[PDB]
Amino acid sequence: KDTIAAEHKQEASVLLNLHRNKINYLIGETMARMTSLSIAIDRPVDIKKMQSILEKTFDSEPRFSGLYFLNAKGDVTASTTELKTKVNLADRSFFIKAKETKKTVISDSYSSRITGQPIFTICVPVLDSKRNVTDYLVAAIQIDYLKNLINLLSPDVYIEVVNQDGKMIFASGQASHAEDQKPVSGYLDDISWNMKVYPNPVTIEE
Amino acid sequence: EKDTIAAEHKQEASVLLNLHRNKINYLIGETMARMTSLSIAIDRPVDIKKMQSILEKTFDSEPRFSGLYFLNAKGDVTASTTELKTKVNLADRSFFIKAKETKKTVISDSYSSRITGQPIFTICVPVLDSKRNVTDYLVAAIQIDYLKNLINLLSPDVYIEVVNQDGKMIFASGQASHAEDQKPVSGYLDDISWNMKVYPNPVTIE
16 A cells, blocks of 8 residues: 555656646746847837737737736736726735836736736836836736646646645645645745645555 | 665656756747747837847846847848857758748757857747748857756766757766666657657665
């Protein structure tokens, strides 16, 4: 029984690596796209050009809740989501941190002010020649997209992702599959979310 | 007995194979993403002075690149992170030929850089006008050494080999003597036809 259990633990550890890599790739690639956009856009930014870019970047990319451009004040000035009212994001932690650090920020999860759904965001400050922040690129990723990705590959195993405060980010599978099991866990690269993959129990065969 | 520890050594070679393939696949995917976002963000028609600055900013602090270049439709290098001594034309390169014909991103096999003289592989992204004619090319050359050092840094003590589809050695990490009497766990990368072979460690006295 110890031998099958050990196979099951190794399998869980394989899934842990597989699924974290998928998420790390999505996050990393998005950081790289937003960074390249911030570098290549011609100053001063033409807002209709930026709107076109965001739409083209968004197109056929289910990972995104939306892509947005903000002015120095945090007003959303371009948006893949058709906005019904003016939106300002200056109060968001990621915005406060991006402004302060003048570096890319990857936020914890929260409920989108624009769509009402759970997202997390990658924010890249756009700088002028004097290193002053003039604008912000914001890529909002849909948490549910990540969850569904994992669940489709691994429907029969219980996987949890939680943040440092212990907030559930998402959970995939039936928690019952986890009974009497200790999980195999590990953090993501760009955000301190911890993924826990529970090994499946040893069945009657044996 | 032995067979049980050998099975563990094999599983860890498999873990390493996936770790390292994931790393290189990410590097290639991220670089493609950076180049495609660049072509989308920049004003058209492309201004060569602005492209030159963008390439320098992209290249700066990126050990991965041998160099970044922009080619005109004839294959002349028109922007370059590498100081050029004479005119350079890459129209004879296989990747250029395939990029021109397919009008899609191409990833090349390894070769010796005409510009730096070092072993590299390149990622080439054609730039198209409104009517889908190819007018220019973005070229990102990555140093093989960078990949080799990347693998070595993670796994000094195990023998790993990367060979292309024809059996040409791309690079090896570690001492070949560690592979003696072992069968490798192997797999191809995603976007380039290189096969990575990770040899498990021998069973020790313990």
